[PDB]
């Protein structure tokens, strides 16, 4: 049962996966234009 | 008869291994995606 | 309960990098417009 | 006559060991190839 | 005479001790490399 | 507070590049006038 | 402490400028004089 | 040492000015004198 | 070396412009004294 | 030595000068004899 | 060619020349014998 469980849930892996990107997206966003700021400045 | 069964269900332990290979597919592929939105980001 | 502040967070993420922006603003204005004098100078 | 029967059996404990060996061998390849799909998704 | 027979015996005791050890060598044989295929599968 | 801290001197460095631009003022006189004396001899 | 020292020197600069216009005054001097003796003989 | 060297020059400059000025009134003396024989002549 | 080489050819520019001088009186005379015939005749 | 060319010549000038002097010899005299006739007549 | 050629003409302007006179021996012809009719009037 437990094995199922698990083959239900994979499939639930890929959907905290899906999410990884998003949260990702933002983190990565920042900091590339901000330091593009300072790139102008130097 | 248990020698013989466990003959017949290896192979069983093969399908198994078949299964095993698929749901650490999905984990894998979790997180490697969406820790390279995080590799952009940074 | 983690994952789920993070999501509330990356947005935050996106707060930081929007500030980012700015303080490299200054530093690249400084800097820029002063040794442009000084390469009217030499 | 129970000694001589136990020599030729010996040869059977050799018998024995010669399919021990397979079925293991299917158990140590699953869950090998299996792991190692988690390993990449990890 | 029972006590010269079992010394001419006695000897026949490293006969049969001979012989043990070869039964013995297939059935300790066995086992070792089987249980090897189980241990490389885990 | 050090986010903060940066927030403040940004403006700091703003401060900085308005005296850049003055000393650049300075040196590019400097020069300019000095090897129009020696245009003026060639 | 070296920012502050340029702008005493800034001034400094100023002071070499006005050297320089002096020695480039007796160069320029040259040979426009002379070069007009040429011209008068062509 | 050299910025020093260039103002006891600096005079130099004045020197070789002062010589040139002799050289071209000899250039612009020839000339002007033989050309006014074939003016007669013309 | 060279402006001395200058120097004592001009004097050289002297005796060049000396020559010139005679060349152009008989071109001067020529022409001086058939056109005074022509004179006559008209 | 085209200067000394020029040498040669003038002279060369001056032989020209002398042939000028006849050819305008004939057009002067032309001239006044007949226009003499002319004033007779007059 | 042309200093030739008005070499050859001189003589030309002598013809002319020759001409001149004649032509004015009649003007100058007339004009004194009837004038001098008109004398004898007067």
Same mark, same amino acid.
Do not use: C, H, N, R
């Given at each position: 049962?437990?094995?199922? /469980? ?6 639930? +892996? *890929?959907?905290? &996966?899906?999410?990884?990107? /998003? ?6 966003? +920042? *900091?590339?234009? &901000? ?8």
């Amino acid at each position: 049962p437990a094995k199922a /469980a698990f083959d239900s849930l994979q499939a639930s +892996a *890929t959907e905290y &996966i899906g999410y990884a990107w /998003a949260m990702v997206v933002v983190i990565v966003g +920042a *900091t590339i234009g &901000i330091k593009l700021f300072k790139k102008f400045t130097s």
